[PDB]
Amino acid sequence: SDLPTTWQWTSTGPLVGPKNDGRGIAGIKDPTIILINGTHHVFASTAQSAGYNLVYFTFADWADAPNATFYYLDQAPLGTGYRAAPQVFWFAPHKLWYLVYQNGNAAYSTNPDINNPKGWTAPKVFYPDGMPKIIEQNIGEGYWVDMWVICDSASCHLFSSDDNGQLYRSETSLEQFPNGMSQPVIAMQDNRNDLFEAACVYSLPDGKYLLLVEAIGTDGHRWFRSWTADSIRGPWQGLANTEQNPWARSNNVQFDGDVWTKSISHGEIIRDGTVDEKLLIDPCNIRFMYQGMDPSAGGEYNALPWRLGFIAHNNPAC
Numbered sequence: 001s002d003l004p005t006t007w008q009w010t011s012t013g014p015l016v017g018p019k020n021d022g023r024g025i026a027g028i029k030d031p032t033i034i035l036i037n038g039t040h041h042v043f044a045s046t047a048q049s050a051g052y053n054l055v056y057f058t059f060a061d062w063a064d065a066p067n068a069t070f071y072y073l074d075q076a077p078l079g080t081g082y083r084a085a086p087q088v089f090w091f092a093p094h095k096l097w098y099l100v101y102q103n104g105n106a107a108y109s110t111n112p113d114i115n116n117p118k119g120w121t122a123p124k125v126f127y128p129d130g131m132p133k134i135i136e137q138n139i140g141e142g143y144w145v146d147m148w149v150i151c152d153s154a155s156c157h158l159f160s161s162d163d164n165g166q167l168y169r170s171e172t173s174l175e176q177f178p179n180g181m182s183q184p185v186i187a188m189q190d191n192r193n194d195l196f197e198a199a200c201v202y203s204l205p206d207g208k209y210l211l212l213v214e215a216i217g218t219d220g221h222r223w224f225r226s227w228t229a230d231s232i233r234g235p236w237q238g239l240a241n242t243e244q245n246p247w248a249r250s251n252n253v254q255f256d257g258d259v260w261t262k263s264i265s266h267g268e269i270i271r272d273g274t275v276d277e278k279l280l281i282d283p284c285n286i287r288f289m290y291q292g293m294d295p296s297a298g299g300e301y302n303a304l305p306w307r308l309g310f311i312a313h314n315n316p317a318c
């Protein structure tokens, strides 16, 4: 509607990477990002071969991202252990910020003040009885990953992937959230590489919804596919979801300076304005914080040199 069926982008250079601070982190990854009156708030995965946890950092101008201080959330009650792939939003019924992420289950922490990285609660889980049978049945050799909540004015939905080609969806009422999530349905299914992980589900000003999912291309590089729908529940119609017409991929991203990555991987659209549980974006002014890496690098996945930049949407349709 106010979305083009073809997409073009401009990318920054790699702005955010690990600090030389003794933690040994290899990759900074999987950002969630919101913008409040000039100030960006970011949460990201820390990745290395010993494990994953979470970091917070903030900055106004993008040029200040590289020197932004890292506030590691293992200093909060959120703590040490496995945590990855965060999502932040204000949950207006509770007047608390939620941070959704994975820990082997689907988890959340809350905090009344986004500026306090020490304030994030120890995790609670959306599935207190463990991994749903449907996921156990279909996961194969995959991993349960990349949790995402979006609500409308009646219901809150929790999406997740299995790195095996399923996208799962559970729901509960707005009034019960975070409790009472249903056993998931398979919301969408494809071969592994075509519907792999890193979903985002957004609302649009015209009342429709946008689904982005990360995929692994025939060249082995990460890219994003897209769909729209009239309902969070689907059905989903292709938007830009092929290699020749991608949402974001090496063939529709132009670099300012060097071409520092071929993969366009796990990211989020910068949500400004309301930063609440409706996950509204402005289709006229899309910017996407994403992860990339030197396309010549290899080795163990967990020690890959992931860095964060942004792509800015060049051909807005409004």
Ligand SMILES: OC[C@H]1O[C@@H](O[C@H]2[C@H](O)[C@@H](O)[C@H](O[C@H]3[C@H](O)[C@@H](O)[C@@H](O)O[C@@H]3CO)O[C@@H]2CO)[C@H](O)[C@@H](O)[C@@H]1O
Residues within 6 Å of the ligand: 084, 143, 145, 163, 197, 216, 220, 301, 302
């Ligand atoms: O494209 C490189 C490589 O990707 C592999 O997928 C990665 C996924 O992107 C990643 O989500 C997953 O990460 C898990 C990790 O391997 C585990 O050690 C565990 O502790 O947690 C992570 C899940 O949160 O890893 C896989 C593989 O490492 C594809 O599997 C592979 O085919 C592909 O070449």
Ligand SMILES: [Ca+2]
Residues within 6 Å of the ligand: 030, 031, 032, 085, 086, 087, 146, 198, 199, 266, 267, 268
């Ligand atoms: Ca994410």
